[model samples]
Target: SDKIIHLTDDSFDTDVLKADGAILVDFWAEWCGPCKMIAPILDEIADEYQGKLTVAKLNIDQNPGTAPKYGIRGIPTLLLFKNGEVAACKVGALSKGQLKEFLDANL
Candidate 1:
């Protein structure tokens, strides 16, 4: 399935913006509890919407440059991108239904 592809700052442009579909970029760190909570939901959503959208993850701890470039000041940040630009953003952990609602509305 299309569950959670790890994206680095280097591959972000090509893998995300250049991809031929809607993209959801999850910015998180290993230590965040809320981020952990959202993990399984993300995976499920990814698999369900595999061909319709692209789901990805970026570790703020490891991707320092891209972290700041996106002005991510907190954990569990989600950015929805389309055609190389940010289309929507959701901060903090959100429930599966809420996330699906958000994606459905924006996509």
Candidate 2:
């Protein structure tokens, strides 16, 4: 099972936009420290919500298209997409519980 699916500019639509169910796209890059901080939290989230959630990691630097199109200006931005449309958006770093709250509120 793909707990975390890494996406690029070209693959965004097929993997996320046209995909069904709850998908949390983690917008980040290798340089951001907060991205590193949030990775494990997302990992825990992926594991916890196995069937109900799909975690997609998109590197902002490498995949420029999707990020700019979605107005992602910061690293570690979390965008929750449901049924080919964005449902919620959150930016900055957050505590474990805070992230849980984010997902809980959306999904």
Candidate 3:
């Protein structure tokens, strides 16, 4: 997750919603097994999709307000936002191929 941007409730507005093009926001927690499982996959993605799409990480525990607003009931929820609107929502950990497929279909 090192390559991914760490977003907070305050930065969400500018870093994601108001940002240009597609952005994948990973809603996760430190203690979640699946969240940790997909961390490196996301890191690889952040590098592979460097300029095309923005990849970000948001800790649900630290940023309480944003999760409920989006009705996120699970960790590893990936929300793909395009031009300020949610284009796709995937709940649960996805493999590299699946993640790329999601971006391909949405982006």
Local distance difference test, each candidate: 0.84, 0.84, 0.87
Cα error, candidate 3, residue 38 (Å): 0.4
Model 1 C-alpha lDDT per residue in residues 1-107, reported as the tens digit of each score:
24678888886553345555688988988999999999999999899898888898988889877767777899899989897778999999999999999998998
Worst 10 residues of 3 by lDDT: 11-20
Candidate 2 residue spans exceeding 4 A from truth: 13-16
RMSD values, in order shown: 2.3, 2.3, 2.0
Per-model TM against the reference: 0.90, 0.90, 0.91
Instruction: Provide the lowest-lDDT 10-residue window in model 2.
Output: 11-20
Residue-level lDDT for 56 in candidate 3: 88
Per-residue lDDT of candidate 2, residues 1-107 (tens digit)? 25898877886663357667888888998899999998998988889988989988988788878887876778889889898788999999898899888888877
Best by TM-score: 3
Error of 1 at 72 (Å): 1.1
Instruction: Point out where model 1 deviates above 4 Å.
Output: 13-18
Give the Å shift of residue 17 in candidate 1. 3.3
Residue 48 lDDT in candidate 3: 95
